[PDB]
Structure 1
Amino acid sequence: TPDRHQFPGLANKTYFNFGGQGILPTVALEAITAMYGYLQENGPFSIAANQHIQQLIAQLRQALAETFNVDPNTITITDNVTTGCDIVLWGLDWHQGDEILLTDCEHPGIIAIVQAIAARFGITYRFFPVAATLNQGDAAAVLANHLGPKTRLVILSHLLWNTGQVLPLAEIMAVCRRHQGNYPVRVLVDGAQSAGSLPLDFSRLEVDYYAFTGHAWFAGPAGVGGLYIHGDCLGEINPTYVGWRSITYGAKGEPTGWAEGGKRFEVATSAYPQYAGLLAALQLHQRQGTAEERYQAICQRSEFLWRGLNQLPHVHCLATSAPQAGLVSFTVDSPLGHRAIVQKLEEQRIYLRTIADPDCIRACCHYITDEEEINHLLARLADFG
């Protein structure tokens, strides 16, 4: 039984875009507003304010650490999912000829970093087909058939943003560690959709690097995200974008080394009030139930929506089995085109999004989504054909 009242934005609209950005809870806006007030009353720049900011940062780092069941030292605070990927990709000691493998469902922004890396260090990159494994096949086996002697890193999204498939991460990791080549194969995971929807425990689930954001499923404000790096991989990642937050200081205030753990990849002044907003959102989700309970609630909503769409004659879900998470992608048989359809729905205050590849429409159901909203969506979709 979710407390929908904590998310005022739900009230006069039918929202299904949590994957793009979550509806901000009241407690998050209160924390943001309270931080501006604290800074105005006590600083904004002063011993008291600077200490309050450092304490707030430690508190967020700790809440994130607890969310994934890991030590705070493995957590880096960023502004979004992408930055975490930039940190890992630019930090690796690349040699000409090294190879990177990405799935064919990765984000355009991520592909751009890889192209930038290829141009700078002379590495190469290839894609491997996973989109087609939504209803059959094995993504891990596809990867195994693409691994080569020069493969050094694999990049994949845990929950695919376009089709809604949850990749078999554990099996994929095993395939990578089993491989014998010039390098021990490592895996960088884009968790833009998975973090905050799927139950994640990095002490049970072995991962190398995991990038995420707080503004989508975690329902925090735009501008705050994070990155997990396993303690055994920290040494392989050289800091790149650095600043006063990245170092330790000497007698005369001179740089003497890298800050502890993930702090070495943090740069400088950030939007502190927003950090308090994310912290408040994180604590709110825990009061609603465990990650597991919230996950099952999300799946109950997506399946209900999925079933409803299966009944509509001119709508075709991409998944032939129940969604493994909160994402439900589908096409609509109509002369209008998916972008015009999404715009018409928004005109009715029903919010979904268009996907470029494959060309389809995507809806996100969260644990706070209810049956009336789903039925209202189904009702309006019934109009096209």
Structure 2
Amino acid sequence: IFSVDKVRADFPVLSREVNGLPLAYLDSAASAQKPSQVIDAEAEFYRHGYAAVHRGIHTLSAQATEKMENVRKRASLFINARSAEELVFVRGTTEGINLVANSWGNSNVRAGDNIIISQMEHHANIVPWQMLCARVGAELRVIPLNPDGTLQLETLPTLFDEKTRLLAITHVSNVLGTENPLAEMITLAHQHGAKVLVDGAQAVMHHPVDVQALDCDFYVFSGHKLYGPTGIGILYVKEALLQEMPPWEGGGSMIATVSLSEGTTWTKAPWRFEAGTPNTGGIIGLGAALEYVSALGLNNIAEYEQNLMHYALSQLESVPDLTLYGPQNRLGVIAFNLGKHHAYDVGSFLDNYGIAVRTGHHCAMPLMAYYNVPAMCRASLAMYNTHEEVDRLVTGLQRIHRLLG
């Protein structure tokens, strides 16, 4: 059982004041605050054990290399991959998706083929596929939305066919909070021989994730949303697919031999996908974030967060003219619009009260278009957020509506 006061004491930013008022940070879905255990693990590495990591012979380099490969193993256990060698360190979810789109996509998606995404996807899980489709002459097909923010799954029979090579789908929507029924969609996709890439950027901080039970071919997530540093993320790929993938970036460490007259040969997976000095400091920090979350327990986090969400949804019913977008069982985020006020103005007033929410299209323009709105406000209710911050959001929306209505 969870203690929000003890969790909050680990996060130095939560004591901050903004505009002379106490900060209510409701924007973790854009990027999470980081516990002092994470900030200090990276700082301590730089202050005491820093070195280059390419299996250097000297002591510091050999120890830094082992720290990096231990984080690879820890991340692999966190998502229940079968092996540490199925995980590639990238800059974040976006880079992971681009790596798959070029390395797997360029060799497996041909002219006349199709790829399926959904209308709720974030731009990170849209744009790389649009680019691939334009390079190879393939078609980007779209699973449409229902008004409650769930996918229209009855349309799958018209979208999947013998030319469908890939399903790229979000685990959890960054706007709606919808959790998609991945295991069943993946079963469907595999019956056609299609691979499945899952965008898990908003899933990994809310409940346990198991890629062997999901049976996904590719899974991606970013460290900075998982209470860790920026500049680091994970791409998981089934071993059999990753072993056939050609390299994306070229340079040092991803090669086996380099010759200017006989050409270059590549090293084995995962190292073939990691060119140049890695973000070692970010990798040490991510390892600490995974330990921090695992010590609190994801089932404990999920229980507290669901209870906070239930409290917020119940309190938000007393805000006049509030429109909510997404299903009632939403995870993590609440997307809303207040009466006819533009989201930018509502978010500006909320910021003037010390409450940080995100406003705009949330990198999901197609999703905004589906709802016929230019933008939305979004409150994130993470594990370190409280009932009191929910009460300040409800009061603030009531005040805004009184003032501007």
Task: Please give the TM-score of this superposition, normalised by the length of structure 2.
Answer: 0.85
Match of 1:11 among 3, 9, 15: 15
Match of 2:332 among 326, 333, 344: 326
The one-character-per-residue Cα deviations of 1:226-250 (angstroms, maximum 9, x if unpaired) are 1111123224532221322323359
Please name the residue that 2:59 is paired with.
48
Matches of 2:161 and 2:388, distance apart in 1: 51
Matched ranges for 1:1-385 at <5 A: 1-2=3-4, 3-12=7-16, 13-38=23-48, 47-70=58-81, 71-92=83-104, 93=107, 94-130=109-145, 132=147, 134=149, 139-179=152-192, 184-216=193-225, 218-248=226-256, 257-289=265-297, 291-319=298-326, 321-323=328-330, 325-334=331-340, 336-356=341-361, 357=368, 358=371, 359-385=375-401
Matches of 1:222 and 1:238, distance apart in 2: 27
Structure 1 unmatched ranges of 5 or more? none
Q: Is the 8 A contact 2:148 2:326 kept in 1?
A: no
Secondary structure, aligned partner of 2:344: helix
Q: Is the 8 A contact 1:247 1:264 kept in 2?
A: yes
The one-character-per-residue Cα deviations of 1:18-40 (angstroms, maximum 9, x if unpaired) are 11111011011111211221256
Matches of 2:140 and 2:44, distance apart in 1: 47
Task: Please give the TM-score of this superposition, normalised by the length of structure 1.
Answer: 0.89
Matches of 1:286 and 1:249, distance apart in 2: 40
Secondary structure, aligned partner of 1:118: helix
Q: Is the 8 A contact 2:323 2:336 kept in 1?
A: yes
Q: Is the 8 A contact 1:133 1:139 kept in 2?
A: no
Matches of 1:368 and 1:101, distance apart in 2: 36
Secondary structure, aligned partner of 1:267: coil
Q: Is the 8 A contact 2:322 2:337 kept in 1?
A: yes
Matches of 2:194 and 2:244, distance apart in 1: 13
Matches of 1:284 and 1:68, distance apart in 2: 15
Matches of 2:116 and 2:238, distance apart in 1: 20
Matches of 1:109 and 1:202, distance apart in 2: 20
Matches of 1:9 and 1:313, distance apart in 2: 32
Matches of 1:247 and 1:43, distance apart in 2: 17
Q: Is the 8 A contact 1:224 1:274 kept in 2?
A: yes
Structure 2 unmatched ranges of 5 or more? 17-22, 362-367
Matches of 1:49 and 1:205, distance apart in 2: 39
Distance of aligned partners of 1:319 and 1:115 in 2 relative to their CA distance in 1, 3 Å threshold:
closer
The one-character-per-residue Cα deviations of 1:343-380 (angstroms, maximum 9, x if unpaired) are 22122221111242143211111122111111111111
Secondary structure, aligned partner of 2:278: coil
How far the C-alpha of 1:6 sits from its partner, in A, is: 0.7
Distance of aligned partners of 1:74 and 1:31 in 2 relative to their CA distance in 1, 3 Å threshold:
same
Q: Is the 8 A contact 1:309 1:317 kept in 2?
A: no
> How many percent identity over aligned positions?
24
Secondary structure, aligned partner of 1:232: helix
Q: Is the 8 A contact 1:306 1:317 kept in 2?
A: no
Bigger Cα displacement from structure 2, 190-199 vs 237-246:
237-246
How far the C-alpha of 1:148 sits from its partner, in A, is: 2.4
Q: Is the 8 A contact 1:80 1:212 kept in 2?
A: yes
Matches of 1:363 and 1:131, distance apart in 2: 22
Matches of 1:227 and 1:316, distance apart in 2: 36
